[PDB]
């Protein structure tokens, strides 16, 4: 005969389950995932700045003027990118240069040693090779000039540049090591030669290492590539009696603390993100992520978790 007031709790049609230290697979009325497990499958801008995509080339091929190849948040290379160095040899401190170029604001290519007036006593046209072909013709890097003797003589060259860009200047050059004596004389005349490069910080002398190495792109000789960063007010000096692949174009740039290089075939797109992955971008709301351990930007922490469901509601008991 009694009137009744019952106290109770909400139940619904939810099938969400969570795990607790005490029990597994507990169905709950409401929950949320702490684990971000979805990405937009795109390479987007970071901090609203687009990445630098290198097309089919790598950084060497791009930074040297390989015939076949303003600011950015990171760099993208495709896994099947072509060789950068066409003429075989060593790119000294290559990983470091890549790292230091990974992210920059302000970046300007300029002709540091103008081709027309910088080398009156040397030939700046004949320096082409079958190693660096372009449209059926022997060619060479655009950013360097392979100087050779003009009419049977190669005089001592001495050339200096003063950095008047209010920022670092990247300068790259090559050192040529002919395969044999004849090639040495054919190119530079002098037989026994040296190259010297020095700034207020950098200083190195080079001498050709004449030898017949395994043929790579029809070259038994070798070309080694070098770079340095000239501080704003500083001067850099080149001196040579042969074998010097001089700078033509250099790069004034402002380096940012640093990001990285993403090597992926994932398409680049006009989107924004705070966290980039090689597989695609992820919107950083959640604290954890299982897309990819290799990320760039302000990212969730990578975990090997498949599910991180956080209970917000109570145990669901419809019965």
């Amino acid at each position: 005969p009694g009137d009744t007031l019952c106290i109770g709790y909400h139940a619904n049609n939810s099938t969400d389950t969570v795990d607790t230290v005490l029990e597994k697979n507990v169905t709950v009325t409401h929950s949320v995932n702490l684990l971000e497990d979805k990405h937009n499958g795109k390479l987007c801008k970071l901090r609203g700045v687009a990445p630098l995509h290198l097309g089919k080339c790598n950084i060497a091929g791009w930074i040297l003027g390989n015939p076949e190849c303003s600011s950015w948040s990171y760099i993208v290379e495709t896994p099947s990118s072509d060789n950068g160095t066409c003429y075989p040899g060593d790119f000294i401190d290559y990983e470091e240069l890549r790292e230091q170029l990974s992210s920059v604001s302000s970046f300007e290519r300029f002709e540091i040693f103008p081709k027309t007036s910088s080398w009156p006593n040397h030939d700046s046209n004949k320096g082409v090779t079958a190693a660096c072909p372009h449209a059926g013709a022997k060619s060479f890097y655009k950013n360097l000039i392979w100087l050779v003797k003009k009419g049977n003589s190669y005089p001592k060259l001495s050339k200096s540049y003063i950095n008047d860009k209010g920022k670092e200047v990247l300068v790259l050059w090559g050192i040529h090591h002919p395969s044999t004596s004849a090639d040495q004389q054919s190119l530079y005349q002098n037989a026994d030669t040296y190259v010297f490069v020095c700034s207020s910080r950098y200083s190195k002398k080079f001498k050709p290492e004449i030898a017949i190495c395994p043929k790579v792109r029809d070259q038994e000789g070798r070309m080694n590539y070098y770079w340095t960063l000239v501080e704003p007010g500083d001067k850099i000096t080149f001196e040579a009696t042969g074998n010097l692949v001089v700078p033509r174009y250099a790069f004034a740039m402002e380096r940012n603390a640093g990001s990285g290089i993403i090597i992926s075939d994932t398409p680049v797109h006009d989107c924004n993100t705070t966290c980039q992955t090689p597989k695609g971008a992820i919107n950083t709301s959640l604290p954890f992520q299982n897309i990819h351990p290799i990320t760039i930007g302000k990212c969730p922490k990578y975990v090997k978790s498949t599910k991180l469901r956080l209970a917000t509601g109570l145990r669901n008991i419809p019965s």
Binding site: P1, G2, D3, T4, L5, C6, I7, G8, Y9, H10, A11, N12, V18, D19, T20, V21, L22, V26, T29, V32, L34, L35, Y74, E95, R98, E99, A257, G258, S259, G260, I261, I262, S285, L286, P287, F288, P293, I294, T295, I296, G297, K298, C299, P300, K301, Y302, V303, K304, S305, L308, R309, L310, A311, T312, G313, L314, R315, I317, P318, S319
Partner: protein, 170 residues
């Protein structure tokens, strides 16, 4: 389970109560139905919401480019790098996994508690003017219409007003 209410003495939940987490089902002369307690429900919402945003917003992430490139004569430092990434990996996986198990258990206990307190808060008002028939239900000794019911639901219950009558039907 920690507070004995949910899946305890109140064995099951109500699909009929669709406007709140905790509430009542009344049954009087004027009719019956479900009604979620808005106070305790909104408070639980504000707090579980604060809980979620806490586990999320306290994750200050530094700007980092995880990837590194090493050449063939740098396997050692490459492996050091690996050890660093793998070390952070195991640390975050383990903590995230436990954080969720542990917090999920606290969350359920928290709701269990909220129900327990709601039951015993109603029980302190009614006292002996009703009987605890179980399953989280109260069978009044007096006649409790709508205005009477709502007075119980929202704190302002008048016990002395029904002391006379309650005593009779016993």
């Amino acid at each position: 389970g920690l507070f004995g209410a949910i899946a305890g003495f109140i064995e099951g939940g109500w699909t009929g109560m669709v406007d709140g987490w905790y509430g009542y089902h009344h049954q009087n002369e004027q009719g019956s139905g479900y009604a979620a307690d808005l106070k305790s429900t909104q408070n639980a919402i504000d707090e579980i919401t604060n809980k979620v945003n806490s586990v999320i917003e306290k994750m200050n992430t530094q700007f980092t480019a995880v990837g590194k490139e090493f050449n063939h004569l740098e396997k050692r430092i490459e492996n050091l790098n690996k050890k660093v990434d793998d070390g952070f990996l195991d640390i975050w996986t383990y903590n995230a996994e436990l954080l969720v198990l542990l917090e999920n258990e606290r969350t359920l206990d928290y709701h269990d508690s909220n129900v327990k307190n709601l039951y015993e808060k109603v029980r302190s008002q009614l006292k002996n003017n009703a009987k605890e028939i179980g399953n989280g239900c109260f069978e009044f000794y007096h006649k409790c219409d709508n205005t009477c019911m709502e007075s119980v639901k929202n704190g302002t219950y008048d016990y002395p007003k029904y002391s006379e009558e309650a005593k009779l039907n016993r």
